[PDB]
Amino acid sequence: MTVNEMREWLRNWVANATGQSADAIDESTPMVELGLSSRDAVAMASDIEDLTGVTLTATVAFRHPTIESLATVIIEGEPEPEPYDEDEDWSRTRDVEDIAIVGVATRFPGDLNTPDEMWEALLEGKDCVTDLPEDRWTEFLDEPRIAERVKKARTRGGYLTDIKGFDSEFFALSKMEADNIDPQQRMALELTWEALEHARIPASSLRGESVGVYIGSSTNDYSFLAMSDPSIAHPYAITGTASSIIANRVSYFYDFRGPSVAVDTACSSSLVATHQGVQALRAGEADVAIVGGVNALVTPLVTVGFDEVGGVLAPDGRIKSFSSDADGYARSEGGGMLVLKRISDARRDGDQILAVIAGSAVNHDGRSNGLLAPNPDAQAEVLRKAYKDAGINPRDVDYIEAHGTGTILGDPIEADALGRIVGKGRPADKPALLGAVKSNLGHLESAAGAASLAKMTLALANDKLPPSINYAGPNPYIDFEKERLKVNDTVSDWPRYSGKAIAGVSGFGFGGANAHVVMREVLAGDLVETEAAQRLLEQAREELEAKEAEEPTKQLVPLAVSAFLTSRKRQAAAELADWIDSPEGRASSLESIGRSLSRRNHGRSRAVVLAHDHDEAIKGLRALAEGKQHPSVLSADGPVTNGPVWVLAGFGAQHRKMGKSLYLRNEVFAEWINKVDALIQDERGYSILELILDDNVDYTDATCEYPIEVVQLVIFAIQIALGELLRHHGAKPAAVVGQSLGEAAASYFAGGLSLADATRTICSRSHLMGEGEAMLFGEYIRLMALVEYSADEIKTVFSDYPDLEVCVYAAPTQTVIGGPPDQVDAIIARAESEGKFARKFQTKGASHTQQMDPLLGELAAELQGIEPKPLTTGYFSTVHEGTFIRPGSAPIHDVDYWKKGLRHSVYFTQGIRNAVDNGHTTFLELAPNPVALMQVGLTTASAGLHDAQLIATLARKQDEVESMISAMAQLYVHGHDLDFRTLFPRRSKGLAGALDFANIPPTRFKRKEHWLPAHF
Amino acid sequence: DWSRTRDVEDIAIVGVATRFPGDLNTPDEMWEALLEGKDCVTDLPEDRWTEFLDEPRIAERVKKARTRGGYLTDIKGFDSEFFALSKMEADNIDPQQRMALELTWEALEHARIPASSLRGESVGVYIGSSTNDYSFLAMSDPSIAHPYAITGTASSIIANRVSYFYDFRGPSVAVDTACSSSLVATHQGVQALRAGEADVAIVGGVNALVTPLVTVGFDEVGGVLAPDGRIKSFSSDADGYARSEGGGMLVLKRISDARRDGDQILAVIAGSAVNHDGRSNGLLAPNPDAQAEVLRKAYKDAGINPRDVDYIEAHGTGTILGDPIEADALGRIVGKGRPADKPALLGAVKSNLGHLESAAGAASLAKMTLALANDKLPPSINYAGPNPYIDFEKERLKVNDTVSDWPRYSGKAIAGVSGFGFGGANAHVVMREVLAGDLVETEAAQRLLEQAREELEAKEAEEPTKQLVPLAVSAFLTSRKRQAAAELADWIDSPEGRASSLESIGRSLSRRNHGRSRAVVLAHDHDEAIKGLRALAEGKQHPSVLSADGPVTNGPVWVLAGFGAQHRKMGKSLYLRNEVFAEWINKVDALIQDERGYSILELILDDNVDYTDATCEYPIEVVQLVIFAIQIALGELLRHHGAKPAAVVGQSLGEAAASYFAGGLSLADATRTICSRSHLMGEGEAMLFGEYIRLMALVEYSADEIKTVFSDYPDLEVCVYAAPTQTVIGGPPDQVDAIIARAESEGKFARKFQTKGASHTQQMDPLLGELAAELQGIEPKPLTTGYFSTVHEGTFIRPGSAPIHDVDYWKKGLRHSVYFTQGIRNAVDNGHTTFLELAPNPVALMQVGLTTASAGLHDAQLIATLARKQDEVESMISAMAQLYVHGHDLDFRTLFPRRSKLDFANIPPTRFKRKEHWLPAHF
Known part of the structure; x- marks a missing residue:
């Protein structure tokens, strides 16, 4: 009884179970579909056995629902195991990424x-x-x-x-x-x-x-x-x-x-x-x-x-x-x-x-x-x-x-x-x-x-x-x-x-x-791919390892809280304070808490809590949850309209150990000091890094060979490093303004001069003032002083003294003037006659005065070869009467520009006021010590701005790492460009990293019922 | 720079x-x-x-x-x-x-x-x-x-x-x-x-x-x-x-x-x-x-x-x-x-x-x-x-x-x-x-080929040949197919149809959908097309129209017979008028030249070669090689157009071609089997004379009925089981001259062949040793298509099974009988109904017809390929058209290769019978 001999009784019996002719049945369709039920299947189970002997299982009597397949599977019996190509190539044909x-x-x-x-x-x-x-x-x-x-x-x-x-x-x-x-x-x-x-x-x-x-x-x-x-x-x-x-x-x-x-x-x-x-x-x-x-x-x-x-x-x-x-x-x-x-x-x-x-x-x-x-x-x-x-x-x-x-x-x-x-x-x-x-x-x-x-x-x-x-x-x-x-x-x-x-x-x-x-x-x-300077650096690190083992420094962690509304921001703070106070919060490192917050959404209404341990965080968050102003909390209800203005001043902002601590405790800041040191060494032949790391350098002639010269170079170096540290964290100025020595750094940050060429301007300007001061003695000296007179009011007071000239337009009611000592010792009394303010500087560089006339020739020679470039950011030039220069304009930082600035007055107050008229309200001071922020404050008030943002970066008697964190936090709170995630760099791979992040509470929603009223 | 960064295609x-x-x-x-x-x-x-x-x-x-x-x-x-x-x-x-x-x-x-x-x-x-x-x-x-x-x-x-x-x-x-x-x-x-x-x-x-x-x-x-x-x-x-x-x-x-x-x-x-x-x-x-x-x-x-x-x-x-x-x-x-x-x-x-x-x-x-x-x-x-x-x-x-x-x-x-x-x-x-x-990227044989082309250029300039264009019409229902034909006939009769070449009309139809119900109209000019389409539009059967209401259940069976299918100019016309067919003859000619040392293409192109000893040095040998060559070429011409067999069966010499088309032997190795088998029968016939001869004959007896008639003559043996009521037997002439009368006693049919090759007889016993030697080195392969082996009692061999075409297989077939009728009937039981005959002349289709009727199949599809007294290009078009009409694999677009870089006519488009369907709704 071969396949067909078994193929007709199936056609017969299915006809027997359905009353159709001998061959009316079709072998290309499931038997169940022909009006056949599973009840007869078990009845057929024996039929095949008694007729043949092979037993049909459910799976075999299912994968072969047709008659022809059924007829063969009984006679032959699932004889079709297809071979397996054991060597098939399953590699990618296109170069694509996972x-x-x-x-x-x-x-x-x-x-x-x-x-x-x-x-x-x-x-x-x-x-x-x-x-x-x-x-x-x-x-x-x-x-x-x-x-x-x-x-x-x-x-x-x-x-x-x-x-x-x-x-x-x-x-x-x-x-x-x-x-x-x-x-x-x-x-x-x-x-x-x-x-x-x-x-x-x-x-x-x-x-x-x-x-x-x-x-x-x-x-x-x-x-x-x-x-x-x-x-x-x-x-x-x-x-x-x-x-x-x-x-x-x-x-x-x-x-x-x-x-x-x-x-x-x-x-x-x-x-x-x-x-x-x-x-x-x-x-x-x-x-x-x-x-x-x-x-x-x-x-x-x-x-x-x-x-x-x-x-x-x-x-x-x-x-x-x-x-x-x-x-x-x-x-x-x-x-x-x-x-x-x-x-x-x-x-x-x-x-x-x-x-x-x-x-x-x-x-x-x-x-x-x-x-x-x-x-x-x-x-x-x-x-x-x-x-x-x-x-x-x-x-x-x-x-x-x-x-x-x-x-x-x-x-x-x-x-x-x-x-x-x-x-x-x-x-x-x-x-x-x-x-x-x-x-x-x-x-x-x-x-x-x-x-x-x-x-x-x-x-x-x-x-x-x-x-x-x-x-x-x-x-x-x-x-x-x-x-x-x-x-x-x-x-x-x-x-x-x-x-x-x-x-x-x-x-x-x-x-x-x-x-x-x-x-x-x-x-x-998937997770891979100078000689003497060293000695001072060595001792500095070792001198620090002792000062920390005796008393370790508690790290300042900024905690960022934000929301689209100030009301929700306060609620988020209150819920975060409770979680920190909770045991799960106590068992979490404060750095991990900060890291988690740094990767949350940074909304319109922002706030930062500067904390050293958990307790200060809770006590600060609770105050922020209410409206209580707190010195450890920075807050703002919304962003500012215009970007920040970087103020590159620096005259008089020198102190003993400026820049030392940050150099040892910040690699990015140290990297940029090293780059500036190399360039200055090429131009002058001595390393300022030696001056910075030394603790016996008071930046005075008593302990410096060229105090007039090295001070300008060190302050210049710090300005470049601080500005490049801020850029490392995502900060960028909307406009720049300088004051009589930061014009070199100002030109760099504005895109006018490269760092190398900018270094030449300050290097040449610094030492030429160095020898210029020494070469003169006696009556050829010119002094510098401050008076409580206004620009317009000077116009009717130089009739008294014709030799005197204006150096810096510091503020609307304050102006720096200089000239022969006989006309400056007396005019201080002239100011004191009307009960006005006056002061005599103790530095004789006498810049922006007639003393710079012999130096102008050498400055052109030494600066021949610099390549001015168009401006990438706004520029309030104090050399050009404080006027505003739009980004993308023609280059301005040619030798004639530098000749002018070292000879004529500084229009600082005019430049500031022009910035206020353009709508700027945030002013950032890059310097070792904030000396110009008080001057900028006076101009803004006079211009009708009693809420300007005045942010310092470093200050004498204040920690430097903390000062920079506070400065960056303020920029973030007011909406200026700053990647907060950069303040919490990942230190682990993720295995050992797992604890990099804390399980802070998630963003909460206030759900309301919204639906359509409908019927039928 | 606005150039592409990725290597991509337009x-x-x-x-x-x-x-x-x-x-x-x-x-x-x-x-x-x-x-x-x-x-x-x-x-x-x-x-x-x-x-x-x-x-x-x-x-x-x-x-x-x-x-x-x-x-x-x-x-x-x-x-x-x-x-x-x-x-x-x-x-x-x-x-x-x-x-x-x-x-x-x-x-x-x-x-x-x-x-x-x-x-x-x-x-x-x-x-x-x-x-x-x-x-x-x-x-x-x-x-x-x-x-x-x-x-x-x-x-x-x-x-x-x-x-x-x-x-x-x-x-x-x-x-x-x-x-x-x-x-x-x-x-x-x-x-x-x-x-x-x-x-x-x-x-x-x-x-x-x-x-x-x-x-x-x-x-x-x-x-x-x-x-x-x-x-x-x-x-x-x-x-x-x-x-x-x-x-x-x-x-x-x-x-x-x-x-x-x-x-x-x-x-x-x-x-x-x-x-x-x-x-x-x-x-x-x-x-x-x-x-x-x-x-x-x-x-x-x-x-x-x-x-x-x-x-x-x-x-x-x-x-x-x-x-x-x-x-x-x-x-x-x-x-x-x-x-x-x-x-x-x-x-x-x-x-x-x-x-x-x-x-x-x-x-x-x-x-x-x-x-x-x-x-x-x-x-x-x-x-x-x-x-x-x-x-x-x-x-x-x-x-x-x-x-x-x-x-x-x-x-x-x-x-x-x-x-x-x-x-x-x-x-x-x-x-x-x-x-x-965007649109780019033998010596004496030549003489006969040269004259043949020139002899044809004269016969065509005197009277050009009207090309036969197949016109394909189809639809999902026979009713719609008739309507489509009626609309197409009107368009051809129209001036726009008259102004269009018949080849362009065919090309356009070849790229339309090929539905369940199919029909082909074989026409030479417009008038024959119209007169054929009109008949198809009605139910009138017409000799120039091939039609079928639906497809067949099983694929075709290729029948590789060929004994007795020789005639004078077989294969000549198609060789000159079809490049694909000519290409495959040339390939087979080269291989045979290596094995034997003479070119069959010379034999084909010659018009004085009657395939007889009077005009051939080894008629018993060259005839088998030429017929073998034509079978390979015809089968590869059909494959060129998309045809493929569902199963294969051979008869006593097509087993060589059958093995090739079934995937058992390569074309080279298959050529060795026929080459060795051919000449060994060549010298085997000559070496014997007189009483050692064995004759071959046909009788109107059945396989079972032979079982009770060889008691009369023991030397006789069965050669081919041709049909249920017909069988080829052979043996000593004294037992074959008489048994013809034995059949004539009961008013039965009988006939004596006039070829003395005497295959599948005892005469092949001395030859079996040399056949094993000459065939040592052939590489059998598994089967890619079904195979009804006539050597193995006509049993069916499923595709993908173990190789069967070893030397022992070839020894057996050249010695024992051919189970042709059994193999055919087994195919009918498997459900096959279409039988395609690859040969220079249909000699086995009449034998296959008898077996199918006896098996209870009075509507089998029996398709010939070439026939004496019939044009060859037309015969192959008709054969391919029949396969298409019954639903078998065939790319109709291949029959109209693009000759230009007016190729297409503006035939009427498919028509739809739209009815209103919508939802009754209110409010």
Whole structure:
């Protein structure tokens, strides 16, 4: 009895069981489809045995539902094991980069609103499916027809707890606008914030950047509520319920300038969105990608429809994936989102990489047996494409996060495809572990991919495999042993068949769109790639090691708190103070607390608490929580309009140990001193670093060979270093102004002269004043003095003394004048006649006077060769009568410019006032000691500005590291450019780094109820 | 530097389909309307929105709205039968899905790509759609609504249903950016094709105005819709826009693939970009900075300097504040550096059609594709004068309000297409025209060959041969196939048909879909075509028409017989008139020359070679080699056209060719088997004389009936089991001369052969030793196709089994009987019904016919290839046509190779039978 001899009785008996002719039966169709039931199958079980002897199992009598296949499988018997190419090359054909996952956000049933909550629930095997809440769908349960039809439906599923809540104020929306916004859009906004917070990327740092947004969704269900009254509906509903706006509104609010797209494949939407994000990042075209999906069950229309179809929804509402009692699924609402970057960028930016996406693929079923019928051939193809894209042999996969919808006919098809690709070649003792998060949460339609990706990311990061629940036993129509698969129904360790963890995530649309994403764990390989001056430096470090062992210095930690409103900023401070006082806060280092805050959003209203230990932090945060001003708290209700002005003064700002402490305790500051020292050594032939580190150098002729000359060079060096230290932290001036010696540094910071050429100007200017002073004696001397006269009032007082000339226009009521001593000793009395202020300087450099006439010739010679450049920032030139020079204008720093400044007066007060008229209010003083900030204060008050920001950098009798932190904190509080993250550089790799960050409280939202009132 | 930083390939546009207002249902119709400056905006049709105008509140609110726009003429129509949908299912399908199905068919037809050729292939589908408006109709009664509405009105299904129906296996996605959706969909298609991941891409967008809800909302906003409904783009009287419905679609390929496949390239997409406004001054406010950035990104992707652009197809919505913003961005990027005499020309198809919301990008791309293909610039209409807030001279822009030539500022035409969503998503696509550079990258035998060609040039100049053109007609139903034939006959009879070459008509048909029900009309001129198509239009069977109502279940069986199929000039004509056939003869000739040392091509081309001892030195030997050579060439000619056997069977000499076509032996090793077998029978015959001779004969006895007749004669043995009632036997002449009378006693049939090779007899015993020696070194391989071995008792061997063609196999076959009838019957039991005979003359098809009838098969397909007294080129065309008609693998496009760089005729397009499908709803 060969195949055909067995092929007609099958055609006979099936006719015997269906009353058709001998050969009317067709061998190219399942026998069950011919009106055949499974009841006769067991009746046929013996028939084949008594007639032949071979016994049909459920799996074999299922994978061969046709007659011709049935006839051969009995005669021959599953003789078609296809060979395995054990040597296939699974390497990448295109040179592409792996993608890093750095952030995860979750809204899933069961109140799983954080990755930590989700991980705990998964390890516990929590079942998040529940009955319909009493408060949901009430807009429809007020009509008996729909009410009784809904009551007849299944209606169990995964529901959210607060779907009507929304912080409209936080997202800057009016009540009428917020009432008309689909909850899908609300989830997208909230999840984006949470994901960036989880990734420790300040949202403010990404504004204007090329960030892509790809979100999947498949139902505009909130639209139906707006059609309750096709006249009362407000035009806000158009933007509130449009699918495209789900992504466009996220881009709008966060100021993302990358691609913004809404995808729809209806159960693989999140995976497909992840695919576009990965492809975008690989092709340039985007630097960060936000990928995810959302789903909301706002009306019962789709649920009732699926119930009407029949045999789709599980009666008890539990998805029993790959189980012998699988009987359908239940719908769920929620959302999830991931932050993606290229792995090199994440490594370069010091981001914690949770997992790596190696590759992905997308395809379609084609003409399957029906539109809604899955096709195993297409599923096998998408698996193959994904693993060729990832460059990973499927034999090495450890875990498959499956579609797993719990349908008794769909689960075998998924398992068949997996065995074709992932199971071939494996020994029976190395099976791919299998599971589905749909068993926990239900069928999150357009968020299933997001749920699956979130689960696997946490599994790889936390190094454990959570169980799949609702598993009574293997599905009879799946031979798991042959397919080399095993359902993980308990908490398990990663097998690591290849030495590293590898997972796959699958998602299949009901229309036939398939996707697969390949993930792996992050590896360790993904995180790689003068003579005498020394003596003073050596002793200085050793002299410091003794002063610290005897009494260690408590480090000053700046704590940054911010929000979009001052009211919320105070509340955030109060909640942070309580957490620090808590034992968890006490057990955390103050530097780790600061580091975590530095990576939070830096909003419009900012505040900084300068603290040394926990207690000072609490006592400062409490005061900030109230309106109590406190000296250890810097605060401001909003930003300033214009950028800062850097004031490069420095005449008279010398003291004994200026610059020493910062040089030893700051590498960036020390690096720039060394560069300036080298250049000065070339020009002059002596090292100023020797002068700085020495403690017996009082910068006086009693202890310096050329005090007039070295003082100017040292102060110049400090100005360059301080300015380049601020730039290291992200600070940049909006305009620059100098006073009689900072014009050299001012020219550098304004982009006019290079650092080398600027060093020549000061070097030449310094020593020429050195010999100029010595060469004269007696009556050829000129003195310098300060008087309480105004510029206009000098105009009518030099008739008394014609030799006198104005040197610096310090302030509206103060002016520096100089000339022969006989005309300066007396004019001090002339001022004292009217009870005015006067003072005589004790330095005889006599700059901006007639004494510089013999020096002008040499200055032109020594400066011949400097290359002026156009200006990159505003410039209030005091040489040119305090006028303003716009950025990008023609070069001005030619030799004639330097000749003029060393000869004529300094229009300091005019330049300042011009800056105030331009709207500038913040003035930053780069000097070893603030001597000009008091002068700038006078001009601003006179100009009608009694709240100017005057920021010092270093000061005698004050610690230097603390002074620079305080200066940088002030710039941050007023909204000026400053990367606060730079103040907390990572010192560990992340293994030993884990404790780099503290578990500070998360941003809190004030949710309000927003919904549409509707009926029928 | 505006050069490409990534090594990527340009994308070719090969097909366009259109549903646009004004009854613009073909690219040709659309082009005519554009050149005319047609205004396609109209008032609301009386039959639209009637589901809502039955309630006074909505009625008076709708009557207050603008409501003018671009509407379709038949939105309720749908050929549900063509797309295999039930009435209840078809009633619940959004018109957006209907457009997608219809446009895909039309685009592939315009591209001359048979839809059947793309089934199972990696084709991506990216369609932009932004509203689910048909869903609202289904909510009229939140209880009466049928579950079919879920699939009928879901956005994802707009693309998934297209993939399902056409069997596309690439990515299938629905995109939503709401006015740049079509452009964004085009972006994904381009990116997919560049990254592998897809071999063809279907990109487009659709939009339908099913309900008045969105229109009334936009009217409620105020200051958005134009009072008169005319979009006056970039004009001084711009006052808003009007909504429109429609769809469009493009077929995209990598340019190398289009060049390789011989597709007509209409235009080339060089690059594209997508970005977002960011925080603009309001969600609905366009941002010129972002628009400038997307232009820059697109032209860096395309590797083209924007200064060289000739034409910009702008968003151009006609808003008096939005048009200046668009012009500002264009001047920033596209206008900088241009002299005042070289301005970028500017226009907008929205002035013709209105604002096709998610189909605007499709409309714009279709316009520019036709403009580049047809080499003209159509005017932009509704232009009274420049907008006062735009300085066109400074921006270096000029509105094209008349038909114009391409300026070609760079020597070639370059255009840009822009699209901006109301949510802030921007896109730009850079296009250019196709260039000419995109379309590149024995001694004595000669004498007989020379004279043969010259002898033919004389026989053709005296009377040229009328070429036989096969005309292919098909459809999914036989009823529609007949209607298509009737319409095609009328077009051929028409003057336009008479003015078209018959080869061009055939070429066009060869690139149409090859459906389930197929028919071929073999014609020499127009008149025979008409007279044949008319008969096919009816049920009248006609000898010049091959037809079949459906496909066959199993693939063909190739029968490699050949004993007794020799005649004088076999293989000569085809060798001279078919290069592929000639190429394979030359390859076989070389191998035989190595094995034997003489060229059979000399034998073929010679006309005095009757394949007899009177004119051949070794007639027993050369005949087998020539027949073997023809079988290889014919089989490789069929494979050249896409034919492939499902199983193979041979008869006593085709086992050599059978082994080759089944994958068991290579062509070289197979040539050794026949070469060794041939000459060893050559000397074996000569070495014996007199009584040691064995004769061969045919008798009307059956295999079982021989079992009780060899008692009469023990020396006799069975050679070939020809048929159930016929058997070839051989032995000593005294036992064969008489047994013929023994058969004649019962009035049975008998015949004595006149060839004394005496194979499969005892005469081959001395030869078996040499055969093993000469064949030592052949490498058997597993089987790639089914194999009904006649050596092994006619049993079936499944593909992929262990090699069987070892020396012992060849020893057996040359010694023992041939189980031909058993092998045939086993094939019939496996379900095979088509039998193809590769031989110079059909001698075994009559034998196969007897076995099939005996097995209960009175409708078997028995196809001959060549026949004495019949033209050879025509015979092979007829053979290939028959395989096609029954559904077997055959690329009909190969029969019409492109000869030029008028190749195609303007045959009528596929016709649809539209029926009204809609939902009955109120309130």
